[model samples]
Target: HHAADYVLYKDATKPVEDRVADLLGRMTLAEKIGQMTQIERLVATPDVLRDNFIGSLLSGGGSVPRKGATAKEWQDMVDGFQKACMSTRLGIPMIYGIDAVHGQNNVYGATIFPHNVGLGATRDPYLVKRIGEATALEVRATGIQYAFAPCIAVCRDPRWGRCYESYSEDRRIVQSMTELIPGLQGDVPKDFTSGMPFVAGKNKVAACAKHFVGDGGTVDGINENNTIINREGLMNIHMPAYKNAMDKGVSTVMISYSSWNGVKMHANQDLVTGYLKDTLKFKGFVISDWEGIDRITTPAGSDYSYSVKASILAGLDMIMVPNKYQQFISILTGHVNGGVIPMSRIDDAVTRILRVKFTMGLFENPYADPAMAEQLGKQEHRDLAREAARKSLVLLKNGKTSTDAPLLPLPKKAPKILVAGSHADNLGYQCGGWTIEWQGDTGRTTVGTTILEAVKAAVDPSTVVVFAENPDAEFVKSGGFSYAIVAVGEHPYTETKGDNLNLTIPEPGLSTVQAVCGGVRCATVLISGRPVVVQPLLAASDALVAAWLPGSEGQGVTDALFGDFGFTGRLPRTWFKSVDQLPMNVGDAHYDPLFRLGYGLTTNAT
Candidate 1:
């Protein structure tokens, strides 16, 4: 396809249809098909790319290039794939996409910011946008050009496994947070050092406003389930952010795997093609969720032919066929040849995909810079991450003595101090899902200080700090420690597997808390994505802190634990009392939270 204007402008713009048609006229059928395909890097061999003429490649979750690949290596890998695609008959540069949802999270050393839920608590749009910009830099540093991010899902219920991924339960909050789109897409004017400076050129990767329509409002807060909302509710609640994203020049959008009013979003052309493409006038391409087309068939399974035909017809510009690329290729090719799927529809999808590629400037510079790898997990980035961690923390409760003798700023020279709990030293649990793995790895999977190490660093060199894993009641009593700090919460799990009917601390965690607090005057620190039922345990602790998935910088946690920094974070979501209040929210009719949203306490100097 011929190159056209890469940037979107207000006045001197040729109509998108004319530009698309001009480019489409020059493309061959293989090029068109290549644009429709997105292969996972794990499945993207040189042979696979050649055979399928794939147009895009993605690093799903934790799929990295090589063992211990740095940010530059990720860039190189993407560049190599782009080069390979260009070697094909069409010579179209492939778009590389990654789930850089939270500060290019897949990379080990890249700055890992607080999850969206934590950012929601801050209620700072400018901060969120700056984070988006930083995420873009880290993403582009690896030479990849697309981020599957700024998840615009307005999560009403926190029970969803991916609630941590949503910024807020309030739709207005999500809409106002559109600053993130421009921040990442090179439109933000701020000279924000935390994120990428909006550079004009090939390095500017595109932003995706994702999971279009009601992914967070599903019944029971389940993943890939039907969102039983009426047209008015859907338009009012879930549709605003999308419009905001488009207005900010977001380059792409991904359809949700979930359905609306019993109809799957994949096949819902009225919204995807009709409303999004026609009414809103979004210039970017629409990509499907990972294997989202398969959901069109029966739950058990159905023919790939039927699924492929329906998805392509429903206005999918690209299919994230994570695995089994050959099967998908065959099915799609067969459908097109047999007239089951119209050639016009196929051409439109391919043209749209190519338009995004041209706009992203992938063709101009498609190679990753190995030097940029050094930027990953750098000290400055870590410092920024620490700042985010500090701001993300919420102080749930403090004992009666908290006003004068707050547990914080613990005497640096205390004779004896005890640290206990599963998450005290564990890196995986603190980072949560989408770290080094899809479900996240355990026990120091990446390089960063653990909370225990940070605590040690924060305390005086002369002080004796004890580490106890699963200390029994008798063990705690015999230790005679001055004070105890217990870190415990849900294990690392994401997506459908993490969905919970009851938001309660696990028995082991509660048991550990009871044993430790019963024996020693202690401060409890809860590490979790969402608020859990902790009323029973609250009374036993001298202080309570909610450290929401603070990634890597254990020092940040220690900063708050000690008096180096004060507890400044407020609750982002409502803290419910029981599972019976499944969908209870902050301002609901019967709303009563153990700690209300924006509820957090400060520790005063004694």
Candidate 2:
């Protein structure tokens, strides 16, 4: 055992490439195949990791060891899985990954930052980087070493369900926001190679730049639908952020489930292999989305063998088989043995996977640190999130008329102020999709202040705050309120569920606005993932604010509303006049948006 402990791969002083080569040479076909598979935690067990030599495990959206699992609980759970993997003959530590897309959103009590849509509105890359840093610390606190995050999709249409996951419809904005990668993985050294993976220390986690290449540019903004753009369009729009991610030395790339010009990205050798790996010199591994290869064929998993072969040869290094991983491993191993998939490809995949593991210092520090648990939902990160929320507020309207006094910077000394709308007291809607669950749900989903709570805290002690989900105009007038704060917009949704061709504000949201604003001077705060139809609601409102999914820190919304902080966020995507102008971006020939990109009214802090 002492003699075996002195192996080259076990040596911290050995070069990463040398360690990778040594490990690759020692691995059997089964071990190599195992390195290519990632299983969901629900289907994963200690025995599964040991027997399968599973390289990775993931907690999909809402997948936790238990409900309301704390950071320490998560760390202990993942460490248990790692112990099994380390006990294998190879003793390679298995990497645990989760969709920490926005501040480790799944874990209970972790700080939930504003979704990417809101961050995009902020247009502050440095702020995004700090968020990445905060997110990395929180993720590592849970004992997870990898994050399936910083989804660098250049969302071209607001109708897309995942539009909120994107930084902006504009490529340049998306490119700027890629700073989150460095914040996640930790900054690369000055002399570090461009595409080589780098994770600074225990505080940092391996970052993923994902749903790679045109996941957001789908025709009609359909989730996992084909993107019909040409090479130039793809290169200019969807591909730049990836380039930025690679430059920051992102550890892994997850392939998009969406197709390009009829070919699934999982099966697209030209782009995945030719462009991303060869042309771009991306040195890290290429991973599949959850059950990504299965969807290559119509009904999904219909042509299992072909899916595996196509994806492997297409240059995907890791397959997020998620569930049914044994089947994936069997098919992939059979393909390799039958000469359908080459040894070079298998070796290449394992090498890259090992490279990331070695660079993460996983072999040496294979277990979670208990101290990191304290970092979860720390007050400092929440303050940062509150600041982020404040910056993300886009003031679309300020007054009813040009000659009229502005409605915002509302007097806190008022006798009474009405707070109305579905989102005002709801934490889940404020955080939007990817909170506690996959598509996200409503009503105090996680620990965070609600807009209603923030308003109560922000207003003067004498000012009575009357709350209502949907108050009638009569109720509003009877209150004799000086002004109203109407928070309303689309309900929580994700992926295809969020696609709205009509793009109208969801019911009760529209009705609430009409009810509240019709009677009194109202500051309508639209809390949504993307810009819904606000034109109709604008006429009755004295002031309007696009508070795009301001997570956990609802005080940020109030900070701006009450003039503690000014409205700073600009429109990340074009706020369309109607769904008829769908897909119209900044450069479109027929661009006629209600508010153009970069449109945001400035107000001084009172």
Candidate 3:
């Protein structure tokens, strides 16, 4: 691919720097500006894409080509777009990006791993790295090379709607989980330097560490609210993960939607440029979250021109103008020509974007290859998901007496096993928010073994496995069950919908637990994005497990429950007794959590 003489950027043989420089020098101002623009696929056809020299396209949450599009459909769609891009004068292939935050989550049947909150409970960086690798392969199978994933925000408050997206409140844990960056983008070179960004090859893809600055430290845990963090608090609490992300060679950083001390992060040149780019020496491009640049005004899109100018001046390298892309192009062009936004800033943004596209090997292998298609939801990845699910199970309670055996590691062939709750057999409830749909929907959301299915498989053929979304105490008693497994938790929700002042289990979830556990010797596996006020629920159960939104692979939860794997996960966040302990954490002055951080009872603890 590199044997070309006229164009250095198209040549795979040339040094990355040389290719970048040659292509950059040859591109016209329009083409250069186009490289900085990224838009959604709805309004963007191949002709419009090449005609405008658009550099990238993305399917925002739930923005698929068609409802329940297969992996081949997705890859083929992207391949057509890639061909469209190749028809341009410069022939720079457009890189496809998606919210593969957990295993190409936007696509159907793409193995959905546990959300970050659950994975954090595992406290296994290697497992997280492998999850990243699986995610990369799944994303690649869709003919995409960029993932807006491994969100590295160190969540400080559970009230924040996006807390589930964060790994931990502890900066150190967030730093450790950054192993996902290397896994997603491939390993950094042995002699890799601090300032240079690295994305190793075609097998891997570009990985982003998102919502760049202080997204997880919002006041009152408000979604997209002000983060009143001082420089000290900012540096100490939220900045460490990004530093680790950069070190691991993350290919991109997405700016947050929130404000920092009242100044919108999109307009805050000091942090975006001065701290993240200049001080930290980040070479990869900085992208705006979905319609994030529009949110820069007093009300969104109120001052479009100003929003474009401020965000660009603040060093947002890629403008995710998902819709009304022409308007963005014209406005940005007008600003550059009018000298409101510097020509140098345009060049700078384009340069970073081009460098990233080059690093991702998009020029060499821009089209989708079907070799990775088999990996989308492969059994191996599912097994890994099961492992993650098992490790993420935090045991909070066991039978009261040490003399008797624990409730868990239950006998596989118990005559009658009752599994009750909205989450028990449902795939969507286990996967939680951000499954196949944005703000993921209910009802067998996508493919993967359900807990009910796992329970049936784990037990002997003679053993009867019954599932009930909600069974009354009378029903449990009448069944004459040896033991019952009740899975209960929150419904799917993203952003502010997930935020709650009272973290109590909703309707059928709480009711199901009471009915099932209160009647018989039972184990309650609580599936939620965060810790809920479950003292009442805990008191009734013989054993308790905190299964934080474990995704598609329910076999993982069964792997722990059936004693194939011991309960090793500890609490990543303080599990409060009630809503009164609102702001509690490991070291808070007034902290009085029912379950403290790092508290997880092992199978052998008794």
Candidate 4:
């Protein structure tokens, strides 16, 4: 039975520090170095995993076993890689991480929750915690042990493409959203120390507090650009969420792809080592963003050895080398051998990683749970997502005039109604970026109810509903419909590509709004990642709702529009009047926004 050789690291009853020490002492130089490397799933062959002794694996955006792969299939793929990791000399189980940013966005059929922007509008940290719990079930159902999520960036400008990822512009709001940490990893014990990594049980996955330190203050809202804020500004706007995350016992901290004062985050010792590790005493390991170390040089990986040395010395524990693992392993190993990097540094990195792995209970149960596969997109989770979607809708305008009676809570028994615009029937557009595909796509990218379907389901049996992506003014005039619902906004987009100088709603959307709203009483639902220019549409519409990328549960939108639910969602970001006021936020001197932060109209359900 091979019981002759006893190991303290294999004992579940042992303390995490003891287990980490026992494993560290037994590990060879090659094995210790391998424990620090994280590779992408594409290049993670069984041989590569076993031979390299890879520390971790991740599925990048859209990185799946196959297109439209089921939850079981994902589980099988990850379990396969995990088994290979177990075959190594030390048999250290490799943790698999994925960007489940919004309800396991990579896996198809998972209940897609509203993105952080929508969750921010809700201003309910408890709901975010619930969302995190549901997300953990879905992620674990696929055999993943780590989630690169709860992006705590304090977005200062809407021009930044990743603004939707932030909970809110206010640090307090972002800090409150850190409740997701407890939701994902489970509540820490009363005696638990602050800044130490903790994962409660098998059901929970390790949660990452990501893009550490000032990712949201990039110059001109440029993606991966320099954040030129002063120390006070950084602490005020960005550092609070991190403190909250650490207090909640997040298992990992990921370095940002962005820079601080011209220094890339992957190589900034003062912040990564001095502040996060030394000062705050975060015990969890720090990971690099995708190819993050490579970007330390100007041309990205220009000087590979220096990037490796700089990053490791700066306290980065796991390198998301993804592909090119061989080269990374070779360089890092060489750095340690030639005394370029200290052995003590290697021991510290491995210690933190092992602590998390031990805390995760990976040693005892190092395989996927087939039973959890059923939890993916389960009814309960979908119901939670629906509630989230309902609470995320911000009622920007309720009537044509200040004195006019509010149009919403629209009558569900109308004789006939018109629904127009690109977003009305498209799941991907309503879900926005980070759904299924990386930048996300239009049409039925995954299973979900569209606004068109929700409207049909919500209306009275005798009520006729006419739907069109771009109905003409003539058609609107001829229809003689009781009311119209024009749902339109920016299409799905993610970082860099989502960056827009002019946050204008797309073409046919503007044309559709003009044609429909100009002809009849209309409730224009703006489905977008963030606030877009709406002055033109606002002037013509009877009601306006900012449905910030509500996912999977379109009925939540209809529930509010049809009076089954009241409008309570507030603006997470300031709605600027025009693009000229590019960097305007809540407390700025010239904060002349069309809808100020926290602004929203209230309507009672009849």
| C-alpha TM-scores of all predictions | 0.91, 0.99, 0.97, 0.99
lDDT of 3: 0.86
User: Tens digits of per-residue lDDT for model 3 on 484-509?
Assistant: 99998888889989888877778977
What is the C-alpha lDDT profile of model 1 across 1-606, one tens digit per residue?
224744322112554445556657776666677678898999887777876788888989889876577776677677777777778765667788888877878887777787888777767788777777677777778888888888999887878998888877778778887777877877734443221212244545688888988999899999888899899989888898887786677778899988999988888888887898878877578898998898877862376777787778778889998787778887887788888888889887876776666555555566776666666676876777777787787777666354646666567678889999998999888888888788877788777878889889888887789999789999999996998999998787789977888888776888888899898888888888887778876876777788878887888887777777777777767788886887877667989777777788876433
Indicate the worst ten consecutive residues by lDDT in candidate 1: 190-199
Could you tell me how far off, in angstroms, the CA of residue 181 lies in candidate 1 after the best superposition? Answer: 2.4
TM-score, prediction 3: 0.97
Residues 29-68, candidate 4: write the lDDT tens digits: 8998898999989888999999988999999999999988
Alpha-carbon shift of residue 534 in model 3 (angstroms) = 1.0
Q: Residue 300 in candidate 4 has what lDDT?
A: 89
Instruction: Return whichever of 3 and 4 wins on lDDT.
Output: 4
Clash pairs detected, candidate 1? 75-142, 109-377, 133-196, 134-195
List lDDT for all candidates, in order.
Answer: 0.78, 0.91, 0.86, 0.92
Model 4 TM-score, all chains together: 0.99
For all predictions, the C-alpha RMSD in Å is: 4.3, 1.2, 1.7, 1.2
Backbone collision count in every prediction?
4, 0, 1, 1
